Amino acid sequence: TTIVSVRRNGQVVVGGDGQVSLGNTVMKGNARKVRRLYNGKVLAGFAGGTADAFTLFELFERKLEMHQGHLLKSAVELAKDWRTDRALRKLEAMLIVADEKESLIITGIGDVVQPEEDQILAIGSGGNYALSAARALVENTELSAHEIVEKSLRIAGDICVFTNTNFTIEELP
Amino acid sequence: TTIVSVRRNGQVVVGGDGQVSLGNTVMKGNARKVRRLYNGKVLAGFAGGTADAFTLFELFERKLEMHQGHLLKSAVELAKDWRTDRALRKLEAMLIVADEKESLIITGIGDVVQPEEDQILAIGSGGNYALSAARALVENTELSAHEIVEKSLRIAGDICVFTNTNFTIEELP
Amino acid sequence: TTIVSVRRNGQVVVGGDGQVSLGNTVMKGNARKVRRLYNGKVLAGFAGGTADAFTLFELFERKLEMHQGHLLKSAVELAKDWRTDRALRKLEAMLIVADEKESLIITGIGDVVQPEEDQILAIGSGGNYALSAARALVENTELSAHEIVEKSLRIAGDICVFTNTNFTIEELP
Amino acid sequence: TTIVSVRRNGQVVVGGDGQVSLGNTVMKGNARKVRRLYNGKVLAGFAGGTADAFTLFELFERKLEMHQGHLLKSAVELAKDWRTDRALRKLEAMLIVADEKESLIITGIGDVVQPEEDQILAIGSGGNYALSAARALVENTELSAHEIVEKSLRIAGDICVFTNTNFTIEELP
Amino acid sequence: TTIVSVRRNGQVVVGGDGQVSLGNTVMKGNARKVRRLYNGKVLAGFAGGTADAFTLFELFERKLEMHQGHLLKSAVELAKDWRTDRALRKLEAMLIVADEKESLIITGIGDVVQPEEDQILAIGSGGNYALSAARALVENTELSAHEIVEKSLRIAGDICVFTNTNFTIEELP
Amino acid sequence: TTIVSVRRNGQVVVGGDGQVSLGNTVMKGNARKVRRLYNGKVLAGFAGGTADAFTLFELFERKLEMHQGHLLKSAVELAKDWRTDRALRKLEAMLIVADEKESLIITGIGDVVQPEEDQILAIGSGGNYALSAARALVENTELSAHEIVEKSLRIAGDICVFTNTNFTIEELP
Amino acid sequence: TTIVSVRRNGQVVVGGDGQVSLGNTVMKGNARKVRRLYNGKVLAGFAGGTADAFTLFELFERKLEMHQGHLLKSAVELAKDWRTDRALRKLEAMLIVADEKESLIITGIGDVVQPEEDQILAIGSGGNYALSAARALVENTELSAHEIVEKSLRIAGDICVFTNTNFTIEELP
Amino acid sequence: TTIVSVRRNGQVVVGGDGQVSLGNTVMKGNARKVRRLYNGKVLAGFAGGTADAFTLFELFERKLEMHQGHLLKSAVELAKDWRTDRALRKLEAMLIVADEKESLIITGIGDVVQPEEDQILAIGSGGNYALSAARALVENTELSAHEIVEKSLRIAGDICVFTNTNFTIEELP
Amino acid sequence: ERILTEPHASLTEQYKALMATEGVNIAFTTDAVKKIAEAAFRVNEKTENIGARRLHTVMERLMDKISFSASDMNGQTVNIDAAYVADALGEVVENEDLSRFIL
Ligand SMILES: [Mg+2]
Ligand SMILES: [Mg+2]
Ligand SMILES: [Mg+2]
Ligand SMILES: [Mg+2]
Ligand SMILES: [Mg+2]
Ligand SMILES: [Mg+2]
Ligand SMILES: [Mg+2]
Ligand SMILES: [Mg+2]
């Protein structure tokens, strides 16, 4: 599982592999680890039991309105219960949420991670690899936020033995 | 324990071994790991304490009506509580549910697994083996959804030292 | 993560690195592990899930008023629930709180730590190192409470492979 | 890694993937795991640890050169070296070797084993998978030997995360 | 594996299953675990690790050839080699050997042991099972020796997941 | 540590960080991990344990001096020493060596491995990171070889806590 | 134990605590951990296990006597003995040695390492502490070398529970 | 076991309990753990494992006979044997030896250590206890040496479950 | 090239004097010598460098043919030029695949 979120020149893209795996065997490869939410306004990928995701991206929907759309808030508030609630600590995963202005990574254990002066996010076992490729690209090439994620995932999958080729990207809007 | 669900040319078949085992000894071999439900409309096999199964295939019956028969839903909703409820996380098993349109595998830990352009499902320790045989067969041979599962299980059992010969198949309708 | 609090000649300073890390990889380096609270009257850094921090520096705000600003109290009272509450023991971290008069380190496991005749505090994996540098400095040099912390963190980061350069200091007032 | 071999109608095929996996990452996708021996008249395919597999292979090679290439013999000889009295290094790997005469797998612990009857052999982490596949095919399809192998490996790779798609199929006219 | 031997009315039977189990999978169902020695006048059956069992067997074979086949002697001799002073490899396996004279099992750690009185011996993971069976039968049925063995193994196989049904019963006229 | 090498347009670059990490602390930030051999015509870079890396390097050095510097050969020779019969110390480290002819990494367990095609090699804890970076760059930018390397290492260091910024890039005119 | 050495203005100081800790108790507080070698012209300080530290020291002593006391050389020689081919005992300890020429620490695993530039070296459990202290001081105070050392050790002892106050500072006119 | 020795006013006393503890049970309460050497002019007391303690003692005995009984020397010699090059058995035990000249404890790992100044030495599981006692007494009571020892052991035995009351106090006129 | 002709009793000087026994007259051509030499240096580099003894190889691997049939050539003279040399020394022998050990 490798998820990566790029942001360059007006475009906010998030996309990743689709390889569910049990130990050292493949269980599904067509999966979607990137989904849209909040009336197709906020797109976000995951890395864990896809269910754990929904039960989270659902607690995010609600916990987003209350604070009036302000993304970061909805998040900071989310990691505030993910650790205090004894029915969430059991939902280990990683999360990436992004919209028009910024982008953010949510954590079940630690706490929210705001991007660098490069605006790039990555999670999953194959993460950093993807990140390693992306960063580079958005530093020398003039590629598309969607021409980078693209290539970046390729670079991941071809290394992490848990990340593959069938990725699903989601530009905006 | 090996469960496999095939789908080819109008037929939806599910069948598997029948070897309950305690550590490295046999405790029962005539068991039924595939059962019919919802007024004989939905058939489904398991892989775990058969009880854990019923207490699950019972929570599926109800959680299926609410969403109006739509199989996938009843499932996605099921794995939604299997992880949030502290009285279900203690029910470790694997599950396969299928009906007229599609077929699906349920997970206690991860999350629902939708088949490939081949429509094949498999769980249990001997799973993949069965899967390995099936897939092949439904790719070259013109065998029956019931002539495949058949042979597939044979191929499993003869390898997994926990899967045997007394399988119980369930075509539809 | 390295946090250090110095107190010398009318100034109460607290500042530390900004390297969030997952195992042996870097996840963020621009982070702020030192924050101001109670109407900018009390500044305090942390060392753990930044969230765990807020959910703590929030339980400190309230638990501070009740006892009428008296810092030490608000603290001693804080570590009194951090261990009796089954929803706090799950918030492992380290904390440093300081204001006009004194400075104090809070613990999730042990209990409050009052400084020495030197008025210096330190936590985080890189702590002692920072401490090791500070102490020395505030014993021979006539450096600023802010010219010490400064150099002290540098000395830490360059040793702890979890502490870096992007520190955020907070003098008073 | 996956290495399977099928023998039917004067044809002997031994082929395998090409993935070298270091921990959970990929060293190189292209790797020749099946090769030719004795002037190119006996087929070989090694599994396990790169180091110990190669050192196993080489040792089998010396024997051949020393026994007019008579396979079976050569094997039992090598096996003997582990059964003597001074426990040799005990290489952790496995080899599948065959020629115009017979097929045979050899562990590096000290034994030579023969195929059931379906003349199907398969070692590696993906073996059993490719096995099942072939064990099936063979029983239900007049597919060539150089054909079953080709499809069985693939079936595996799509299952074993340590088994890729860059195969190498050495047959023996 | 299961290897049991019964001796009654001038008859000595030593037979066992034929399953080679690699981890929790099956290498080969047909395997001769009982064989003939000394021109074919002394029966043998090995248990444990394929490698170490075979290397145990062979060592017992040299002794016989060196002691006019006199079983008992041959055994104590071999045993001696482990009791000398330089701890030999210490093979992890077990052998059940017998002929017209007596029955005897030999561990690869250094000892020779004799049957209670019912002249019943059984090693392997299924042993005790087959034992119980025979230990019973014998005490309550004039069933032949070449008969008790046949049924006892089977009783085992239907219990031990590492013991199959493809037996091999070598008796001694 | 991170050691990566890229080869393009008659240029061969092998460079790496300079951090020596003792446990979770830093021994020395400046360290030459890439050096010159054979009168200075073949490049080397070692990874792993200071002790075993150096002792690996030295052994590769003797071989060269003994084989007219012919790299490839020299390697296979050294490798052979581990495959002989008496298992050598088995150094836990890795070397990336190259010259005007080819690139090649050598483990201290006994093998020599070659690059995919992108002529990109990278060992160390940060390797894969620098790899991804370069594996990218190369595929999308006419950046020099002595350039890709420089940027890839850096990308790594900003990720691997055991990889610093004091590089050393030895190229080969 | 803590052993640190600083070198500035023709002065070389190597001093350390004196505590011998058996498990969590104290063997003896007074212990000379820094001593003189080669007629008393080269300074030494050992860390780690009493046994292996002493046996490391002695071995470094033979080398000196054998190489006109030329430090650096002597070191690399000793180091070589671990890199030869027959892995020596591999003493678990560390030595900090220096004289009028240079400073140098030597592990008992097989390597010689040099100081950054601040000519500061420190081994032992308290090392890094004393390090930080000195690494600081030096950068901000014209304190002597025989002075920094004295204060740095102390700073450590007040931190490391295995480092006491009975120092021994051997300088080199 | 507890073995303590005190030296004051021309008197040297070395005495200890007599309990041999096998696991958590008692082998024999009466055991002479302190004995006489060199025609009966040097005192000895061993601790640790019966086997390795005795084999340590004996080795110290050979040395004496070989060095005109000159204690100190004899010790350093023995110690040397562990520091040579071929790591000896490494006995897990400890000895407290003394005579008219000095006191000295010797570990079986390779070192000789001297008393603080209070001339108090104590090894064994109860040592530190008896130590504390004597370390006290001595500092506050003109109690004889053959007296402090007697009381210190007892204080221990009433604390260490592996230290009984059947003492043996060998003094040296 | 130099060792090949210059010294006293150089390789060429020798084979020449020998064939002269069967009643044959051989003549080495500069261009040939040059090649013989390039040859030696080659293999020494490409395989196992044995110094100058290597000339004793390339030399004998070349003079094989004449050395044998030279008895039945009395009267003739032989000219060893490039085209000759180039044809007595194959090009490169054995697949020499050192890859079977690499991954
Ligand atoms: Mg992959
Ligand atoms: Mg089975
Ligand atoms: Mg750092
Ligand atoms: Mg795969
Ligand atoms: Mg069975
Ligand atoms: Mg770093
Ligand atoms: Mg201390
Ligand atoms: Mg007691």
JSON list of N, CA and C in Angstrom, two decimals, chain B residues 44-87:
[
{"chain": "B", "resi": 44, "resn": "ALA", "atom": "N", "xyz": [-23.36, -19.23, 1.76]},
{"chain": "B", "resi": 44, "resn": "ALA", "atom": "CA", "xyz": [-22.07, -18.73, 2.20]},
{"chain": "B", "resi": 44, "resn": "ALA", "atom": "C", "xyz": [-21.27, -19.66, 3.11]},
{"chain": "B", "resi": 45, "resn": "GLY", "atom": "N", "xyz": [-19.99, -19.82, 2.78]},
{"chain": "B", "resi": 45, "resn": "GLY", "atom": "CA", "xyz": [-19.10, -20.66, 3.57]},
{"chain": "B", "resi": 45, "resn": "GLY", "atom": "C", "xyz": [-18.27, -19.84, 4.55]},
{"chain": "B", "resi": 46, "resn": "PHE", "atom": "N", "xyz": [-17.63, -20.53, 5.50]},
{"chain": "B", "resi": 46, "resn": "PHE", "atom": "CA", "xyz": [-16.81, -19.88, 6.51]},
{"chain": "B", "resi": 46, "resn": "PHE", "atom": "C", "xyz": [-15.45, -20.53, 6.73]},
{"chain": "B", "resi": 47, "resn": "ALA", "atom": "N", "xyz": [-14.71, -19.98, 7.68]},
{"chain": "B", "resi": 47, "resn": "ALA", "atom": "CA", "xyz": [-13.39, -20.48, 8.02]},
{"chain": "B", "resi": 47, "resn": "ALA", "atom": "C", "xyz": [-13.03, -19.96, 9.41]},
{"chain": "B", "resi": 48, "resn": "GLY", "atom": "N", "xyz": [-13.50, -20.68, 10.42]},
{"chain": "B", "resi": 48, "resn": "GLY", "atom": "CA", "xyz": [-13.24, -20.32, 11.80]},
{"chain": "B", "resi": 48, "resn": "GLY", "atom": "C", "xyz": [-14.19, -21.12, 12.67]},
{"chain": "B", "resi": 49, "resn": "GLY", "atom": "N", "xyz": [-14.27, -20.80, 13.96]},
{"chain": "B", "resi": 49, "resn": "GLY", "atom": "CA", "xyz": [-15.19, -21.52, 14.82]},
{"chain": "B", "resi": 49, "resn": "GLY", "atom": "C", "xyz": [-16.55, -21.45, 14.16]},
{"chain": "B", "resi": 50, "resn": "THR", "atom": "N", "xyz": [-17.10, -22.60, 13.75]},
{"chain": "B", "resi": 50, "resn": "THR", "atom": "CA", "xyz": [-18.39, -22.60, 13.07]},
{"chain": "B", "resi": 50, "resn": "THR", "atom": "C", "xyz": [-19.38, -21.71, 13.82]},
{"chain": "B", "resi": 51, "resn": "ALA", "atom": "N", "xyz": [-19.28, -21.68, 15.15]},
{"chain": "B", "resi": 51, "resn": "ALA", "atom": "CA", "xyz": [-20.16, -20.84, 15.94]},
{"chain": "B", "resi": 51, "resn": "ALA", "atom": "C", "xyz": [-19.89, -19.41, 15.51]},
{"chain": "B", "resi": 52, "resn": "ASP", "atom": "N", "xyz": [-18.65, -18.96, 15.67]},
{"chain": "B", "resi": 52, "resn": "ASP", "atom": "CA", "xyz": [-18.27, -17.60, 15.27]},
{"chain": "B", "resi": 52, "resn": "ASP", "atom": "C", "xyz": [-18.96, -17.28, 13.96]},
{"chain": "B", "resi": 53, "resn": "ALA", "atom": "N", "xyz": [-19.09, -18.30, 13.12]},
{"chain": "B", "resi": 53, "resn": "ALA", "atom": "CA", "xyz": [-19.73, -18.13, 11.83]},
{"chain": "B", "resi": 53, "resn": "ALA", "atom": "C", "xyz": [-21.20, -17.72, 12.02]},
{"chain": "B", "resi": 54, "resn": "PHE", "atom": "N", "xyz": [-22.00, -18.61, 12.60]},
{"chain": "B", "resi": 54, "resn": "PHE", "atom": "CA", "xyz": [-23.43, -18.34, 12.81]},
{"chain": "B", "resi": 54, "resn": "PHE", "atom": "C", "xyz": [-23.65, -16.98, 13.46]},
{"chain": "B", "resi": 55, "resn": "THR", "atom": "N", "xyz": [-22.95, -16.72, 14.56]},
{"chain": "B", "resi": 55, "resn": "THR", "atom": "CA", "xyz": [-23.09, -15.44, 15.25]},
{"chain": "B", "resi": 55, "resn": "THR", "atom": "C", "xyz": [-22.74, -14.32, 14.27]},
{"chain": "B", "resi": 56, "resn": "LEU", "atom": "N", "xyz": [-22.20, -14.68, 13.12]},
{"chain": "B", "resi": 56, "resn": "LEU", "atom": "CA", "xyz": [-21.83, -13.69, 12.11]},
{"chain": "B", "resi": 56, "resn": "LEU", "atom": "C", "xyz": [-22.82, -13.74, 10.98]},
{"chain": "B", "resi": 57, "resn": "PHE", "atom": "N", "xyz": [-23.13, -14.94, 10.52]},
{"chain": "B", "resi": 57, "resn": "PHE", "atom": "CA", "xyz": [-24.09, -15.11, 9.44]},
{"chain": "B", "resi": 57, "resn": "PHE", "atom": "C", "xyz": [-25.49, -14.79, 9.94]},
{"chain": "B", "resi": 58, "resn": "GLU", "atom": "N", "xyz": [-25.59, -14.47, 11.23]},
{"chain": "B", "resi": 58, "resn": "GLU", "atom": "CA", "xyz": [-26.87, -14.11, 11.81]},
{"chain": "B", "resi": 58, "resn": "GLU", "atom": "C", "xyz": [-26.89, -12.59, 11.80]},
{"chain": "B", "resi": 59, "resn": "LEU", "atom": "N", "xyz": [-25.75, -11.98, 12.14]},
{"chain": "B", "resi": 59, "resn": "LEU", "atom": "CA", "xyz": [-25.63, -10.53, 12.14]},
{"chain": "B", "resi": 59, "resn": "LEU", "atom": "C", "xyz": [-25.61, -10.04, 10.69]},
{"chain": "B", "resi": 60, "resn": "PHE", "atom": "N", "xyz": [-25.50, -10.97, 9.75]},
{"chain": "B", "resi": 60, "resn": "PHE", "atom": "CA", "xyz": [-25.49, -10.62, 8.34]},
{"chain": "B", "resi": 60, "resn": "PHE", "atom": "C", "xyz": [-26.92, -10.65, 7.82]},
{"chain": "B", "resi": 61, "resn": "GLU", "atom": "N", "xyz": [-27.69, -11.64, 8.27]},
{"chain": "B", "resi": 61, "resn": "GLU", "atom": "CA", "xyz": [-29.09, -11.75, 7.86]},
{"chain": "B", "resi": 61, "resn": "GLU", "atom": "C", "xyz": [-29.74, -10.39, 8.06]},
{"chain": "B", "resi": 62, "resn": "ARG", "atom": "N", "xyz": [-29.81, -9.97, 9.33]},
{"chain": "B", "resi": 62, "resn": "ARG", "atom": "CA", "xyz": [-30.40, -8.69, 9.69]},
{"chain": "B", "resi": 62, "resn": "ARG", "atom": "C", "xyz": [-29.75, -7.53, 8.95]},
{"chain": "B", "resi": 63, "resn": "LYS", "atom": "N", "xyz": [-28.42, -7.42, 9.04]},
{"chain": "B", "resi": 63, "resn": "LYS", "atom": "CA", "xyz": [-27.71, -6.34, 8.37]},
{"chain": "B", "resi": 63, "resn": "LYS", "atom": "C", "xyz": [-27.79, -6.40, 6.85]},
{"chain": "B", "resi": 64, "resn": "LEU", "atom": "N", "xyz": [-28.61, -7.31, 6.33]},
{"chain": "B", "resi": 64, "resn": "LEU", "atom": "CA", "xyz": [-28.78, -7.43, 4.88]},
{"chain": "B", "resi": 64, "resn": "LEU", "atom": "C", "xyz": [-30.13, -6.84, 4.48]},
{"chain": "B", "resi": 65, "resn": "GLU", "atom": "N", "xyz": [-31.16, -7.15, 5.27]},
{"chain": "B", "resi": 65, "resn": "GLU", "atom": "CA", "xyz": [-32.50, -6.63, 5.01]},
{"chain": "B", "resi": 65, "resn": "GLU", "atom": "C", "xyz": [-32.47, -5.12, 5.01]},
{"chain": "B", "resi": 66, "resn": "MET", "atom": "N", "xyz": [-32.07, -4.54, 6.14]},
{"chain": "B", "resi": 66, "resn": "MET", "atom": "CA", "xyz": [-32.00, -3.09, 6.30]},
{"chain": "B", "resi": 66, "resn": "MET", "atom": "C", "xyz": [-31.63, -2.37, 5.00]},
{"chain": "B", "resi": 67, "resn": "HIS", "atom": "N", "xyz": [-30.63, -2.89, 4.30]},
{"chain": "B", "resi": 67, "resn": "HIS", "atom": "CA", "xyz": [-30.19, -2.27, 3.05]},
{"chain": "B", "resi": 67, "resn": "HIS", "atom": "C", "xyz": [-30.84, -2.82, 1.78]},
{"chain": "B", "resi": 68, "resn": "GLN", "atom": "N", "xyz": [-31.94, -3.53, 1.96]},
{"chain": "B", "resi": 68, "resn": "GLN", "atom": "CA", "xyz": [-32.72, -4.09, 0.85]},
{"chain": "B", "resi": 68, "resn": "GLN", "atom": "C", "xyz": [-32.00, -5.12, -0.02]},
{"chain": "B", "resi": 69, "resn": "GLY", "atom": "N", "xyz": [-31.66, -6.26, 0.57]},
{"chain": "B", "resi": 69, "resn": "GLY", "atom": "CA", "xyz": [-31.01, -7.33, -0.17]},
{"chain": "B", "resi": 69, "resn": "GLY", "atom": "C", "xyz": [-29.66, -7.08, -0.83]},
{"chain": "B", "resi": 70, "resn": "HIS", "atom": "N", "xyz": [-29.40, -5.86, -1.28]},
{"chain": "B", "resi": 70, "resn": "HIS", "atom": "CA", "xyz": [-28.14, -5.50, -1.94]},
{"chain": "B", "resi": 70, "resn": "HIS", "atom": "C", "xyz": [-26.94, -6.11, -1.21]},
{"chain": "B", "resi": 71, "resn": "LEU", "atom": "N", "xyz": [-26.55, -7.32, -1.62]},
{"chain": "B", "resi": 71, "resn": "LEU", "atom": "CA", "xyz": [-25.44, -8.05, -1.00]},
{"chain": "B", "resi": 71, "resn": "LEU", "atom": "C", "xyz": [-24.26, -7.21, -0.52]},
{"chain": "B", "resi": 72, "resn": "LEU", "atom": "N", "xyz": [-23.46, -6.71, -1.47]},
{"chain": "B", "resi": 72, "resn": "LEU", "atom": "CA", "xyz": [-22.28, -5.91, -1.14]},
{"chain": "B", "resi": 72, "resn": "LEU", "atom": "C", "xyz": [-22.50, -4.99, 0.06]},
{"chain": "B", "resi": 73, "resn": "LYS", "atom": "N", "xyz": [-23.62, -4.27, 0.04]},
{"chain": "B", "resi": 73, "resn": "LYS", "atom": "CA", "xyz": [-23.93, -3.36, 1.14]},
{"chain": "B", "resi": 73, "resn": "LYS", "atom": "C", "xyz": [-23.93, -4.11, 2.47]},
{"chain": "B", "resi": 74, "resn": "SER", "atom": "N", "xyz": [-24.83, -5.08, 2.59]},
{"chain": "B", "resi": 74, "resn": "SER", "atom": "CA", "xyz": [-24.96, -5.88, 3.81]},
{"chain": "B", "resi": 74, "resn": "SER", "atom": "C", "xyz": [-23.60, -6.28, 4.34]},
{"chain": "B", "resi": 75, "resn": "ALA", "atom": "N", "xyz": [-22.66, -6.47, 3.43]},
{"chain": "B", "resi": 75, "resn": "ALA", "atom": "CA", "xyz": [-21.31, -6.87, 3.78]},
{"chain": "B", "resi": 75, "resn": "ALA", "atom": "C", "xyz": [-20.50, -5.68, 4.30]},
{"chain": "B", "resi": 76, "resn": "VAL", "atom": "N", "xyz": [-20.34, -4.68, 3.44]},
{"chain": "B", "resi": 76, "resn": "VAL", "atom": "CA", "xyz": [-19.59, -3.48, 3.79]},
{"chain": "B", "resi": 76, "resn": "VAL", "atom": "C", "xyz": [-20.06, -2.97, 5.14]},
{"chain": "B", "resi": 77, "resn": "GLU", "atom": "N", "xyz": [-21.36, -3.09, 5.38]},
{"chain": "B", "resi": 77, "resn": "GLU", "atom": "CA", "xyz": [-21.92, -2.66, 6.64]},
{"chain": "B", "resi": 77, "resn": "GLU", "atom": "C", "xyz": [-21.48, -3.61, 7.74]},
{"chain": "B", "resi": 78, "resn": "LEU", "atom": "N", "xyz": [-21.36, -4.90, 7.40]},
{"chain": "B", "resi": 78, "resn": "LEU", "atom": "CA", "xyz": [-20.96, -5.90, 8.39]},
{"chain": "B", "resi": 78, "resn": "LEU", "atom": "C", "xyz": [-19.54, -5.70, 8.91]},
{"chain": "B", "resi": 79, "resn": "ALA", "atom": "N", "xyz": [-18.59, -5.48, 8.00]},
{"chain": "B", "resi": 79, "resn": "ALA", "atom": "CA", "xyz": [-17.20, -5.27, 8.41]},
{"chain": "B", "resi": 79, "resn": "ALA", "atom": "C", "xyz": [-17.06, -3.92, 9.11]},
{"chain": "B", "resi": 80, "resn": "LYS", "atom": "N", "xyz": [-18.14, -3.14, 9.09]},
{"chain": "B", "resi": 80, "resn": "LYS", "atom": "CA", "xyz": [-18.14, -1.83, 9.72]},
{"chain": "B", "resi": 80, "resn": "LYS", "atom": "C", "xyz": [-18.33, -1.95, 11.23]},
{"chain": "B", "resi": 81, "resn": "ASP", "atom": "N", "xyz": [-18.96, -3.03, 11.67]},
{"chain": "B", "resi": 81, "resn": "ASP", "atom": "CA", "xyz": [-19.21, -3.26, 13.10]},
{"chain": "B", "resi": 81, "resn": "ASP", "atom": "C", "xyz": [-18.28, -4.33, 13.65]},
{"chain": "B", "resi": 82, "resn": "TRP", "atom": "N", "xyz": [-17.85, -5.23, 12.78]},
{"chain": "B", "resi": 82, "resn": "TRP", "atom": "CA", "xyz": [-16.95, -6.31, 13.16]},
{"chain": "B", "resi": 82, "resn": "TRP", "atom": "C", "xyz": [-15.68, -5.75, 13.79]},
{"chain": "B", "resi": 83, "resn": "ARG", "atom": "N", "xyz": [-15.36, -4.50, 13.46]},
{"chain": "B", "resi": 83, "resn": "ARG", "atom": "CA", "xyz": [-14.15, -3.87, 13.97]},
{"chain": "B", "resi": 83, "resn": "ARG", "atom": "C", "xyz": [-14.42, -2.81, 15.04]},
{"chain": "B", "resi": 84, "resn": "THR", "atom": "N", "xyz": [-15.60, -2.20, 15.01]},
{"chain": "B", "resi": 84, "resn": "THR", "atom": "CA", "xyz": [-15.93, -1.17, 15.98]},
{"chain": "B", "resi": 84, "resn": "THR", "atom": "C", "xyz": [-16.50, -1.78, 17.26]},
{"chain": "B", "resi": 85, "resn": "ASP", "atom": "N", "xyz": [-17.08, -2.97, 17.15]},
{"chain": "B", "resi": 85, "resn": "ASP", "atom": "CA", "xyz": [-17.65, -3.67, 18.30]},
{"chain": "B", "resi": 85, "resn": "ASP", "atom": "C", "xyz": [-16.60, -4.50, 19.04]},
{"chain": "B", "resi": 86, "resn": "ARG", "atom": "N", "xyz": [-16.51, -4.31, 20.35]},
{"chain": "B", "resi": 86, "resn": "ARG", "atom": "CA", "xyz": [-15.54, -5.04, 21.17]},
{"chain": "B", "resi": 86, "resn": "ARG", "atom": "C", "xyz": [-16.01, -6.46, 21.51]},
{"chain": "B", "resi": 87, "resn": "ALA", "atom": "N", "xyz": [-17.08, -6.89, 20.87]},
{"chain": "B", "resi": 87, "resn": "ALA", "atom": "CA", "xyz": [-17.63, -8.23, 21.09]},
{"chain": "B", "resi": 87, "resn": "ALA", "atom": "C", "xyz": [-17.62, -9.00, 19.78]}
]
